[PDB]
Scaffold this active site. Structure first.
Site, PDB file in Angstrom:
ATOM      1  N   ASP A  15      13.723  19.543  -4.691  1.00  0.00           N
ATOM      2  CA  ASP A  15      13.873  21.112  -3.553  1.00  0.00           C
ATOM      3  C   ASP A  15      15.172  21.012  -3.570  1.00  0.00           C
ATOM      4  O   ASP A  15      15.122  22.049  -3.380  1.00  0.00           O
ATOM      5  CB  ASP A  15      13.118  20.479  -2.268  1.00  0.00           C
ATOM      6  CG  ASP A  15      13.590  19.697  -1.492  1.00  0.00           C
ATOM      7  OD1 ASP A  15      14.774  18.957  -2.228  1.00  0.00           O
ATOM      8  OD2 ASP A  15      12.980  19.764  -0.151  1.00  0.00           O
ATOM      9  N   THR A  35       9.973  19.352   0.258  1.00  0.00           N
ATOM     10  CA  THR A  35       9.374  18.065  -0.952  1.00  0.00           C
ATOM     11  C   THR A  35       9.217  16.254  -0.774  1.00  0.00           C
ATOM     12  O   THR A  35      11.023  16.360   0.184  1.00  0.00           O
ATOM     13  CB  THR A  35      10.089  18.763  -2.183  1.00  0.00           C
ATOM     14  OG1 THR A  35      11.818  18.493  -2.781  1.00  0.00           O
ATOM     15  CG2 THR A  35       9.016  19.450  -3.566  1.00  0.00           C
TER      16      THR A  35
HETATM   17  C1  LIG Z   1      15.711  23.710   3.997  1.00  0.00           C
HETATM   18  C2  LIG Z   1      16.626  24.001   5.361  1.00  0.00           C
HETATM   19  C3  LIG Z   1      17.108  22.954   5.579  1.00  0.00           C
HETATM   20  N1  LIG Z   1      18.140  22.611   5.997  1.00  0.00           N
HETATM   21  C4  LIG Z   1      18.735  22.065   7.067  1.00  0.00           C
HETATM   22  C5  LIG Z   1      17.816  21.094   7.967  1.00  0.00           C
HETATM   23  C6  LIG Z   1      18.016  19.662   8.110  1.00  0.00           C
HETATM   24  O1  LIG Z   1      19.355  18.969   8.665  1.00  0.00           O
HETATM   25  P1  LIG Z   1      19.005  17.204   8.938  1.00  0.00           P
HETATM   26  O2  LIG Z   1      19.761  16.615   7.678  1.00  0.00           O
HETATM   27  O3  LIG Z   1      20.183  17.339   9.798  1.00  0.00           O
HETATM   28  O4  LIG Z   1      18.135  17.033   8.821  1.00  0.00           O
HETATM   29  C7  LIG Z   1      18.256  19.103   6.830  1.00  0.00           C
HETATM   30  C8  LIG Z   1      16.628  19.262   5.717  1.00  0.00           C
HETATM   31  O5  LIG Z   1      17.494  19.081   3.787  1.00  0.00           O
HETATM   32  P2  LIG Z   1      16.430  17.970   3.388  1.00  0.00           P
HETATM   33  O6  LIG Z   1      15.117  18.043   3.336  1.00  0.00           O
HETATM   34  O7  LIG Z   1      17.338  19.095   2.161  1.00  0.00           O
HETATM   35  O8  LIG Z   1      17.204  16.657   3.613  1.00  0.00           O
HETATM   36  O9  LIG Z   1      18.971  20.201   5.740  1.00  0.00           O
HETATM   37  C9  LIG Z   1      18.569  23.685   6.712  1.00  0.00           C
HETATM   38  O10 LIG Z   1      19.999  23.980   8.016  1.00  0.00           O
HETATM   39  N2  LIG Z   1      18.401  25.014   6.482  1.00  0.00           N
HETATM   40  C10 LIG Z   1      17.153  24.616   5.510  1.00  0.00           C
HETATM   41  O11 LIG Z   1      16.811  26.439   5.832  1.00  0.00           O
HETATM   42 CA   LIG Z   2      13.036  16.648   1.064  1.00  0.00          CA
END
Ligand SMILES: Cc1cn([C@H]2C[C@H](OP(=O)(O)O)[C@@H](COP(=O)(O)O)O2)c(=O)[nH]c1=O
Ligand SMILES: [Ca+2]
EC number: 3.1.31.1
Length: 129
Positions: A15, A35
């Site tokens: 992703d 993903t």
């Molecule tokens: C997809 C997406 C993720 N994010 C942030 C939320 C999650 O924060 P945290 O890292 O604090 O969990 C993280 C998840 O991405 P990943 O799945 O790439 O880790 O990215 C956003 O802020 N906006 C979005 O649209």
């Molecule tokens: Ca992921």
């Protein structure tokens, strides 16, 4: 929403990827999907799927939604197209991503992806097997 050009710099995982956008290198995180990480089940299959789709494409495009264009980690948030086919949707349709991270104001393609997820689930594909 409208499509803009970019070029692939490097695949990363299911992703995320590194694209050149407006001439600058950026990591992009796909909107509205999750993903598995590479170390998780179906992580490797997701990474491979995204990698093939974006590496084989003649034309990569990015589509920002109406809200936030970069996340807190500096990653671009977009829908990603490979010769007109949305990567985000194709992942979900194959059961290699879940619809996820649906924030208000950046969810234009939600229902499209939810429909794909429902079909993946019906087919018991991959994550849903
Ligand atoms: C997809 C997406 C993720 N994010 C942030 C939320 C999650 O924060 P945290 O890292 O604090 O969990 C993280 C998840 O991405 P990943 O799945 O790439 O880790 O990215 C956003 O802020 N906006 C979005 O649209
Ligand atoms: Ca992921």
């Amino acid at each position: 929403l409208h499509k803009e050009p970019a070029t692939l710099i490097k695949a990363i995982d299911g992703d995320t990827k590194k694209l050149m956008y407006k001439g600058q290198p950026m990591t992009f995180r796909q909107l509205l999907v999750d993903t598995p990480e590479f170390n998780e089940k179906y992580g490797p299959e997701a990474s491979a799927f995204t990698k093939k789709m974006v590496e084989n494409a003649k034309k990569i495009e990015v589509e920002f939604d109406k809200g936030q264009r970069t996340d807190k980690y500096g990653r671009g948030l977009a829908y990603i197209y490979a010769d007109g086919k949305m990567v985000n949707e194709a992942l979900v349709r194959q059961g290699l991503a879940k619809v996820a991270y649906v924030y208000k104001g950046n969810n234009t393609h939600e229902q499209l992806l939810r429909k794909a997820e429902a079909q993946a689930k019906k087919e018991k594909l991959n994550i849903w097997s």
